Amino acid sequence: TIKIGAQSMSESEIIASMLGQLIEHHTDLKTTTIKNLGSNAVQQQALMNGEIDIAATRYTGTALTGTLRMEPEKDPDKALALTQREFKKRYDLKWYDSYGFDNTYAFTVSKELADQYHLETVSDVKKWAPQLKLGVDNYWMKLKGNGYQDFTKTYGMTFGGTYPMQIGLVYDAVKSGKMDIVLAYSTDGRIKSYGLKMLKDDKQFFPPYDCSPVVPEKVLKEHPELEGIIKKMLGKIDTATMQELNYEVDGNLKEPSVVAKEYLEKHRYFE
């Protein structure tokens, strides 16, 4: 049984299920999803100690800072190449090419607020920060490198209130007016239909967050059919599509496994 890890995000559950279903489509391997992994670090340790055989969704900027403790790299291609090289060298892990989407932190407001105050960039809210309530996920306040501490230092603003909550809640928090601004994830499917506006990170504080599966080389050697199966997903899932899939779960109330199955059927399992 191939154990596929998912972080506590709809996106990760969808992709983990899709990869599992694709493996079962092509082979006699059983698969199962190890859900609710809390973070990049949890995924990393689980890969290294055999608790998961595949990490469905890891993100380059997160791993480059968090796991590798390297200086950030602004260019997506260079960041991916560095991550791939160092993951193989340091951990004998294969960090695959991206599925085709990046999922970045994005400061997000209602279009109404953006229109009223001409907000386009993160710097545009600097003068307003003391009068804004910011909603954020339950990790970002303690997060190192690109978390709240470095953000305040780089952008030189502090919000009037900061409210950590489970990430899935921030979208209706800002839509309903409870928060004025939230640190959303750019692939969330609610951003569009909730009429939200992502502000440009004009200081380039956030690194690239291209998403890939990661697998130990030992697992690939023992299951030589996995490489060609994983490859079928790479470069095929763009950000707009990921947003649509996430929406099916969070807005259309479908199970991630059903969303994955329906996508595979629509796209004929990528062949």
Ligand SMILES: C[N+](C)(C)CCO
């Ligand atoms: C996907 N993000 C980079 C937004 C968070 C990962 O924990």
